[PDB]
Design a protein around this ligand. Structure first.
Ligand SMILES: [Mg+2]
Ligand SMILES: [Zn+2]
Ligand SMILES: [Zn+2]
Ligand SMILES: [Zn+2]
Ligand SMILES: [Zn+2]
Lengths: 64, 576, 93, 49, 476, 43, 49, 39, 79, 44, 117, 257
């Protein structure tokens, strides 16, 4: 649905990073390059962005 | 009609009268607890509060009872209802104030269930007395039933959503008899097999084998923690196995402390060699096999699944014979607690690398498979020539199939030996196999070398298509892969044709197991109803309900089934 | 061996081969209440009333149906409290 | 009039088929939802082969 | 080559295509045991995941939704076709094969409390209750209105204050379990009221309240309650490779063992389980999952593709600088000392099972009994006594504990007292006020005696007397 | 199925529980008192 | 489902490419319920005229 | 209550006589009305 | 003696006697053996059985119906 | 009392014991308005 | 309650006593110290200091149940020496080491606020 | 019977992370301090959330859980703020709690994204740590979300959100002279970053007597509290726990005599 605020293992904030990660995906950086641009050296922090799927946009499309 | 009103299954005369739902019964998911004692069973606080035991007022304990009356339907320790001498029942919650009501001698107090109460703990289906074992109530905050690892082996319940039922006796006599006959430490042994039904859990058993390895050294601080955990510890530290470099205790020496009193037991090692006993140095035991326990101390060898297993002559069985059931229950708890503390420091692991083998071993496995396939081709061509002659009383086609199967079997055995040679003491998979707690040598052969022939109903896969098992195969194909033989290990991966044949083997196995359970249960139910009447009288003659004698003495020996143990006469076997 | 020996001995106790089946239980010296618990209650009870037959109550099932303790272990013997042993006793408040 | 025949969802006769994803969003019907189930008394029933 | 045939009429498009949608989700199925793949097909159907994107628009009873659904790190190409990625039923969890406090033994999974606090594996539950006004007769019309003690003959002790004037609870309020959520009054020639109660311990805030005309046209109201449930030790979590188990225990991140990096595995599984089920694929997937996270590209789990080999994945891990086997040195959290044996750790996709401990737990004490047979019956709490099995009674006979067996058989259910004379086996009329009972026909008070037998047995004896066969009870 | 044809396992136990005039695969092992048992040709 | 006959329950060679062997519900009846292969399509059928 | 509590030694089954049934029957003169209650 | 029935108390007899003695203590039976600061009736009952001071005589029923009377002191604890 | 019509996204009061309908929308489906009272929650 | 509250785990009740004195007759001058509502972190540090002390013959720290919050520490000393004195000495040594470490860390940050350069 | 004198050397000092090495100290002391930084150091995070009305797709409970996880600056007022239960003042007030109020309405056709920066705090010192902005929820056109929240002081043990630091890296004895961990193949294993082992030397030679020393600790923080400040606070907190235990023991011995 929406990115979790904190990484499941470290507790480092991932919610702010997700908007930056989407911008890196929009830019030349690939999914691996975007994680390198973030500079996370721990797989758990990289995994949260890589495995996350945004279903919030689908919910927004439906009329309220 | 009135005759129609009388009914059998789901009927008042039979279904309701013979079996009826019982109050004071609690059901919830079960989770294992190593720390909890074997008698103790974890109970959720909410279930414990709902369950109640009627208690006669006693002058010595009146102060506790009045406190329970003061807190009604609020605190966990409280009385939901009070029964007066008249027998009228009063609700504290409905009554405006609990304090105004006054307790009198002989009043009945519905105290909520508390730790130390005795309950009957049973699995949802009971096929034997061992399934139903009396347990001591213990309270834990979470809503789950917590039971010791040792009690799990008689229950035989895997912890995947499984649930169990506990019933609380409301009568002093019923509670006392349940303690005398159904207590879990008393039921550790089984009369039918004359052996304990309780065996060390696989995680503890593999750790025990690693703990009893010769190359185990423990620091003084680590040993002090193990002594603190041991209930059997007498508060006196044993002299260290190694003294001058630093105080050190061997794992076998720490296990000797766990063993209670002075029980003497000898158990053959799981990997113990018959050749070693015939050969010299049998007493020396170079392989550390031939486990021997003397004066309640492990002296030599490595403890194995057989030594701590649910079998006659086991070290736990010897503890039951001399130390007694209560001490044996403490011994089971002590082994688990010490093993867990040692296990976290030692560590346990499994990996693809343990499954993987050296390339030279893989090349050897490929060579034997190639030779077997060539031999099968030679048999097929000879059969077409008709050089092969049918064995008497057997079809030529059957003999040709049997000989091809023999070639596959010998090759699979050779690949299996290559898989065993690749395994090393460092390798985790070999260590689990050596303990025997989990895994098997045959499982290793499937994992590293050849899974083996896949068959349905013990016969090679038939040709569903005309003359062909599959469209990809040619007509009249006698190739081993066509007949479902699998020469590929699980780690290597399975070809789609092999995978389909493997699925057929899995499907047939699944059907037989499900059908078998229903049939065995049905026949057992008829047998249990038929033999329930038979019983032993005061004179010790076994008799039916009619009282016609079945046997003059029980078992033809007039002795308990558990008491008899295997012994060697050593008179008839030697020459005159 | 004791469990195996008992199963053959009870089967051969009659002196004829009998299968463990409902029909085999139906031909027995057991009382009508046991037959009533076996789903043949209507026929046996009419026959018992006509012949004035009386249930023995030997079976454990007959006792449990009436709510009496089954005649198993812990039920056959009856205790007999004795005053002479009671006389050397200490009263408690 | 002969009678009323229940209509399988996402069938050509059914209104949902032939509608764009935006039209489905207005009707609160998911484009992802497979369909193929008859609706009887406001419940989902699918025939089994 | 020496092919079986050189003129094949047709060729398979792909070997993996034959596998079904449930089979495809499992990674490396061929490496895994064939029965284990079958078990996971059942697990995938009962896995808890959002059924459809517009879950809110449709009110569904027992609906299961996932707080943070995540795509698997390793995905089969077939999985994309069934759109499993679009609506995932599981969240990836780091997994280590190790033995710690012994809670993990016998298919139990250790879990991180800190991850549960962050909302990992958290789920949303929706339950819908629907009530329609009934008008079988004009006097039997059942309008929905708030129940009041003065106007209602059958009003329950539970307060009706939560219910609105319409008799329908307001949306957005939090209602405790076993509390009335719908109030209806049936006209009485005052008027008795029919009230529907919440499931016990539902603890669910009302998501929305809907009032609409029914197909019949009678007033129809649907109430949906939403309850948020965190992961629990009782709750079962299932691994993708045919593994299912309850959570053994939950520990704090400091309590959980930590690597040199300090990463702590979300879920810890016993090492013994993997050899018994021979799940070779699960170990490969754990290696692939760590490789995929470092690589930054999603792994392929197709079984017959043969794109990735165990050695190739190990070589990729060595390139990342991680050990090729994937074993990592770990420190016991409490000791702070590096563990003697390195533990292999790899992320494994995990799907939460539908079964939950909270629904399963139930206990009954002094519950209301049915008038016809005096049998124990479930109350509004919905908790009922467990039936005593016929086999369980036989086990008690083998134990020799006759008193306990008698207590469950007679005292626990329908205990009754009857009066009979020695000769006459008829049910003598009993008057409590007189305290004297008389077998009618012989007018006897000396012969009368008190016998305790089950109420079901007493009524059965009366039915036999109606059939003209009289059971006769004699003291001698 | 694994052993000619013999009845073993739970079905054989079921045959003991319910007596059957004919077993599913009846067979009797035969031993010879005469010297024929010792030598294959006489057997 | 009650019937225990082995031949209907057992997987067959012709089933290849038409059904998924792994996708079978476990229980008293094994393999009685099957799911068709994704490539496999049930034919609507055509007039023979 | 006042009546003593004792176990039943034996149970005997015999046909129930109509004459004894009439004596123990609660109703006198039988039931002459099919309706459960007139009003 | 000349009794076929064993002089030693049977395990079933031991269970009933311990339950009966415990039942008496909870009711408020005078204690033949003083309790060692025990509020649990079962614990006192087991010590009373070891003392053999319990006032209980057990009647054993033979198939012919002959009765054998054994005092708690005469009976030997099975355990 | 007050009810919300989903089709036209407007709130129209519905009389008790009166057939449900919407003014100028002809909609018989109504949703009760959110309660005025505020329910506290725990961030944990 | 099915889930224990977090505040209760670290907070002792008024009736509960933080430290309990127990006497062991198994060995001379052996005293058992039990601390309720205590995390594993405090117990590990106390046991190591007691092990370092020559006077303390036996130092053992264990947790009876993980779900329960409690630590049990056993101290054995020479008959002339007192076990309670050893326990207090271990606490003082730990406090002295921590205070010196805190001063050194504070000096180190002051030395390089912007780093070495 | 006297504690050894510890020596502290700081490899790196930065807001994002602090790397420090402590030598001449016991392994148990090194492990205890590492655990203390993660759970014994208090931070200010939202504990109470009340939503007057919710129109967002996410339910009110979902929004409340996200708000608590979001970090709030606690560098100087963690000591100044008091636990609401401990303080005798009203539970909702400025001294013991920080009030956060967010009201967001989207009238544009484009969805408006709610951010942590949007939250308004009565106390300036406690603020959402924004320099990007964390996305709490996305609001569709015509949807308004209004909520009132209060932030209460708590340490890591109480909740994961209250923990003030990310995962802390602790390692010691990179060369395996102690042989605490034994590798079946030393060459396959990669050498540690702090390892002094040469490329030729796959593993360190075993030493009969070894002392754990030169422990390496790296602390990474959200930035609400400085990582070096967290270490200084942790050392005082562990010392306070020992002092409280000594005070309890002194009272207990006084009661005995
Ligand atoms: Mg199971
Ligand atoms: Zn992370
Ligand atoms: Zn009479
Ligand atoms: Zn409208
Ligand atoms: Zn305040």
């Amino acid at each position: 649905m929406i990115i979790p605020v904190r990484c499941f293992t470290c507790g480092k904030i991932v919610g702010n990073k997700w908007e930056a990660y989407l911008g890196l995906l929009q830019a030349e950086y690939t999914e691996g390059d975007a994680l390198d641009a973030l500079g996370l050296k721990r797989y758990c922090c990289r995994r949260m962005l890589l495995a996350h799927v945004d279903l919030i946009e689908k919910l927004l499309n439906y009329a309220p | 009609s009135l005759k129609q009103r009388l009914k059998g299954k789901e009927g008042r005369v039979r279904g309701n009268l013979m079996g009826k739902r019982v109050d004071f019964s609690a059901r919830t998911v079960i989770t294992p607890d190593p720390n909890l004692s074997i008698d103790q069973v974890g109970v959720p606080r909410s279930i414990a509060a709902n369950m109640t035991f009627a208690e006669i007022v006693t002058p010595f304990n009146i102060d506790r009872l009045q406190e329970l009356v003061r807190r009604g339907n609020s605190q966990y320790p409280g009385a939901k209802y009070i029964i007066r001498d008249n027998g009228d029942r009063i609700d504290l919650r409905f009554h405006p104030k609990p304090s105004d009501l006054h307790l009198q001698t002989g009043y009945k107090v519905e105290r909520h269930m508390c730790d130390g109460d005795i309950v009957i703990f049973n699995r949802q289906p009971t096929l034997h007395k061992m399934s139903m074992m009396g347990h001591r109530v213990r309270i834990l905050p979470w809503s789950t039933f917590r039971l010791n690892l040792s009690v799990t082996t008689p229950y035989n319940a895997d912890f995947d959503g499984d649930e169990m039922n506990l019933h609380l006796p409301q009568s002093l006599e019923t509670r006392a008899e349940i303690q005398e006959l159904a207590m879990v430490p008393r039921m550790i042994v089984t009369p039918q097999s004359n052996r304990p039904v309780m065996g060390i859990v696989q995680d503890t058993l593999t750790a025990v084998r690693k703990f009893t390895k010769r190359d185990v050294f423990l620091e003084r601080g680590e040993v002090m923690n193990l002594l603190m955990f041991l209930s059997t510890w007498d508060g006196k530290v044993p002299q260290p196995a190694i003294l001058k470099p630093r105080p050190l205790w061997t794992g076998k020496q720490i296990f000797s402390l766990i063993i209670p009193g002075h029980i003497n037991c000898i158990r053959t090692h799981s990997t113990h060699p018959d050749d070693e006993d015939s050969g010299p140095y049998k007493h020396i035991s170079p392989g550390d096999t031939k486990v021997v326990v003397e004066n309640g101390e492990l002296i030599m060898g490595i403890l194995c699944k057989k030594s701590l297993g649910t079998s006659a002559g086991s070290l736990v069985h010897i503890s039951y014979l001399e130390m007694g059931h209560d001490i044996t229950r403490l011994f089971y708890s002590n082994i688990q607690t010490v093993i867990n503390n040692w296990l976290l420091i030692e560590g346990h692991t499994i990996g693809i690398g343990d499954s993987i083998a050296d390339s030279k071993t893989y090349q050897d496995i490929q060579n034997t498979i190639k030779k077997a396939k060539q031999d099968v081709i030679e048999v097929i061509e000879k059969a077409h020539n008709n050089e092969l002659e049918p064995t008497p009383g057997n079809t030529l086609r059957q003999t040709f199939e049997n000989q091809v199967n023999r070639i596959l079997n010998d090759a699979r055995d050779k690949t299996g030996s290559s898989a065993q040679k690749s395994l090393s003491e460092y390798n985790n998979f070999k260590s689990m196999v050596v303990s025997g707690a989990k895994g098997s040598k045959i499982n290793i052969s499937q994992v590293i070398a050849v899974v083996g022939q896949q068959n349905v109903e013990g016969k090679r896969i038939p040709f569903g298509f005309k003359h062909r098992t599959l469209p990809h195969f040619i007509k009249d194909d006698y190739g081993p892969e066509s007949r479902g033989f699998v020469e590929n290990s699980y780690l290597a991966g399975l070809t789609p044709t092999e995978f389909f044949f493997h699925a057929m083997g899995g499907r047939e196995g699944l059907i037989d197991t499900a059908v078998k359970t229903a049939e065995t249960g049905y026949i057992q139910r008829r047998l249990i109803k038929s033999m329930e009447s038979v019983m032993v009288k005061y004179d010790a003659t076994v008799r039916n309900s009619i009282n016609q004698v079945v046997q003059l003495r029980y078992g033809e020996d007039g002795l308990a089934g558990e008491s008899v143990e295997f012994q060697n006469l050593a008179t008839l076997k030697p020459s005159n | 061996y004791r469990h195996l020996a008992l199963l053959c001995d009870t089967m051969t106790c009659r002196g004829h081969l009998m299968a463990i089946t409902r029909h085999g239980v139906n031909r027995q010296d057991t009382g009508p209440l046991m037959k009533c618990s076996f789903e043949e209650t209507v026929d046996v009870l009419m026959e018992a009333a006509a012949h004035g037959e009386s249930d023995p109550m030997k079976g454990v099932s007959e006792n449990i149906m009436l709510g009496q303790l089954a005649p198993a272990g812990t039920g056959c013997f009856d205790l007999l409290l004795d005053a002479e042993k009671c006389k050397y006793g200490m009263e408690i408040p | 009039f002969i009678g009323k025949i229940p209509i399988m969802l996402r069938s050509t006769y059914c209104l949902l088929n032939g509608l764009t994803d935006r039209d489905l969003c207005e009707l609160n019907e998911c484009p992802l939802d497979p369909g193929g189930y008859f609706i009887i008394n406001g419940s989902e029933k699918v025939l089994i082969a | 080559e020496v092919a079986y045939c050189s003129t094949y009429t047709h060729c398979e498009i792909h070997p993996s295509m034959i596998l079904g949608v449930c089979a495809s989700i499992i990674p490396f199925p061929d490496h895994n045991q064939s029965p284990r793949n079958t078990y996971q097909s059942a697990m995938g159907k009962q896995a808890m995941g959002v059924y459809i994107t517009n879950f809110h628009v449709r009110m569904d009873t027992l609906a299961h939704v996932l707080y943070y659904p995540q795509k698997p790190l390793v995905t089969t190409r077939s999985m994309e076709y069934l759109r499993f990625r679009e609506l995932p039923a599981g969240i990836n969890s780091i997994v280590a094969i190790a033995s710690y406090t012994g809670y993990n033994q016998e298919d139990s999974v250790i879990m991180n409390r800190s991850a549960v606090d962050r909302g990992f594996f958290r789920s949303v539950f929706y339950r819908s209750y629907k009530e329609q006004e009934s008008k079988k007769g004009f006097d039997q019309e059942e309008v929905f209105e708030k129940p009041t003690r003065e106007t209602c003959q059958g009003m329950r002790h539970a307060i009706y204050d939560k219910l609105d004037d319409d008799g329908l609870i307001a949306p957005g309020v939090r209602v405790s379990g076993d509390d009335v959520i719908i109030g209806k009054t049936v006209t009485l020639p005052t008027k008795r009221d029919c009230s529907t109660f919440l499931r016990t311990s539902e603890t669910g805030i009302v998501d929305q309240v809907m009032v609409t005309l029914n197909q019949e046209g009678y007033k129809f109201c649907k109430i949906r309650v939403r309850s948020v449930r965190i992961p629990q030790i009782g709750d079962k979590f299932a691994s993708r490779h045919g593994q299912k188990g309850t959570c053994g225990i939950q520990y704090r991140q400091e309590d959980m063992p930590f690597t040199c990096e300090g990463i702590t595995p979300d879920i810890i599984i016993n090492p013994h389980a993997i050899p018994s089920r021979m799940t070779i694929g699960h170990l490969i997937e754990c290696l692939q999952g760590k490789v995929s996270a470092n690589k930054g590209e999603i792994g392929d789990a197709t079984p017959f593709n043969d794109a990735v080999n165990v050695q190739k994945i190990s070589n990729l891990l060595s390139d990342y600088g991680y050990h090729l086997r994937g074993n990592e040195v770990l420190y016991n959290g409490f000791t702070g000392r590096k563990i003697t044996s390195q533990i292999f750790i790899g992320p494994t996709y995990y799907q939460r099972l539908k079964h939950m401990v909270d629904d399963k737990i139930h206990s009954r004490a002094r519950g209301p009994i049915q008038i016809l047979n005096r049998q124990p019956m479930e109350g509004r709490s919905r908790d009922g006594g467990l039936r005593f099995g016929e086999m369980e009674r036989d086990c008690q006979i083998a134990h020799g504990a006759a008193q306990f067996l008698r207590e469950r058989l007679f005292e626990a259910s329908d205990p009754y007292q009857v009066h009979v004379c020695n000769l006459c086996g008829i049910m003598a009329i009993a008057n409590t006020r007189t305290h004297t009972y008389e077998c009618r026909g012989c007018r006897n008070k000396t012969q009368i005696s008190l016998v305790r037998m089950p109420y079901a047995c007493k009524l059965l004896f009366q039915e036999l007397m109606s059939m003209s066969i009289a059971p006769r009870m004699m003291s001698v | 199925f694994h052993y000619k044809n013999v009845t073993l396992g739970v079905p054989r136990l079921k045959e003991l529980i319910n007596i059957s005039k004919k077993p599913k695969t009846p067979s009797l092992t035969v031993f010879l008192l005469g010297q024929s048992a010792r030598d294959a040709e006489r057997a | 489902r009650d019937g225990k006959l082995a031949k209907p329950r057992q997987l067959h060679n012709t089933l290849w490419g038409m059904v998924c062997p792994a996708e079978t519900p476990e229980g008293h009846a094994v393999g009685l319920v099957k799911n068709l292969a994704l490539m496999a399509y049930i034919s609507v059928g055509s007039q023979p005229s | 209550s006042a009546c003593p509590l004792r176990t039943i030694k034996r149970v005997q089954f015999g046909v129930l006589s109509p004459d004894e049934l009439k004596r123990m029957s609660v109703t006198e003169g039988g039931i002459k009305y099919p309706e459960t209650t007139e009003g | 003696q000349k009794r076929i029935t064993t002089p030693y108390m049977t395990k079933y007899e031991r269970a009933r006697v311990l339950g009966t003695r415990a039942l008496q203590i909870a009711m408020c039976a005078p204690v033949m053996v003083e309790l060692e600061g025990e509020t649990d009736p079962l614990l006192i009952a087991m010590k009373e059985l070891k003392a053999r001071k319990i006032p209980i005589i057990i009647r054993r029923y033979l198939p012919d119906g002959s009765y054998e009377d054994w005092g708690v002191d005469e009976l030997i604890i099975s355990d | 009392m007050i009810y919300i019509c989903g089709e036209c996204h407007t709130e129209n009061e519905i009389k008790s014991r009166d057939p449900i309908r919407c003014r100028e929308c002809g909609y018989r489906i109504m949703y009760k308005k959110r309660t005025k009272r505020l329910v506290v929650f725990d961030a944990r | 309650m099915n889930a224990p509250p977090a505040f209760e785990s670290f907070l002792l009740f008024e009736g509960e006593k933080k430290i309990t004195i127990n006497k062991d007759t198994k060995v001379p001058n052996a005293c058992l110290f039990t601390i309720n509502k205590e995390d594993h972190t405090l117990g590990n540090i106390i046991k190591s200091q007691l092990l370092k002390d020559p006077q303390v013959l036996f130092a053992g720290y264990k947790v009876p149940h993980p779900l329960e919050h409690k630590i049990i520490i056993r101290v054995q000393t020479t008959p002339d020496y007192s076990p309670q004195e050893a326990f207090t000495n271990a606490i003082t040594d730990l406090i002295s080491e921590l205070s010196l470490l805190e001063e050194r860390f504070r000096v180190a940050i002051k030395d390089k606020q912007e780093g070495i350069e | 019977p006297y504690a050894n004198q510890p020596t502290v050397r700081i490899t790196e000092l930065t807001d994002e992370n602090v790397k420090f090495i402590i030598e001449n100290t016991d392994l148990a002391v090194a492990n205890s301090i590492r655990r203390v930084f993660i759970a014994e150091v208090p931070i200010i995070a939202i504990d109470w959330v009340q939503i007057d009305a919710n129109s967002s797709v996410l339910h009110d409970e979902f929004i409340a859980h996200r708000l608590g996880l979001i970090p709030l600056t606690s560098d100087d007022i963690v000591d100044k703020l008091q636990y609401s239960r401990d303080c005798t003042c009203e539970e909702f007030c400025p001294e013991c709690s920080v009030e956060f109020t967010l009201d967001v309405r989207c009238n544009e056709d484009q969805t408006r994204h709610v951010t942590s920066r949007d939250l308004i705090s009565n106390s300036p010192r406690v603020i959402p740590v924004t320099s990007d902005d964390i996305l709490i929820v996305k609001l569709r056109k015509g949807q308004e979300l209004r909520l009132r929240a209060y932030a209460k002081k708590g340490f890591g043990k109480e909740h994961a959100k209250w923990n003030p630091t990310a995962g802390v890296a602790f390692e010691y004895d990179p060369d395996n002279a102690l042989r605490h961990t034994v590798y079946p193949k030393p060459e396959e294993w990669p050498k540690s970053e702090y390892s002094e082992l040469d490329e030729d030397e796959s593993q360190a030679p075993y030493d009969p007597n070894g002392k754990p020393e030169r422990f390496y600790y790296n602390v990474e923080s959200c930035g609400s509290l400085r990582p070096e400040t967290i270490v200084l606070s942790a050392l005082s907190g562990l010392k306070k726990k020992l002092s409280d235990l000594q005070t309890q023991l002194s009272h207990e011995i006084q009661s005995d005599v």
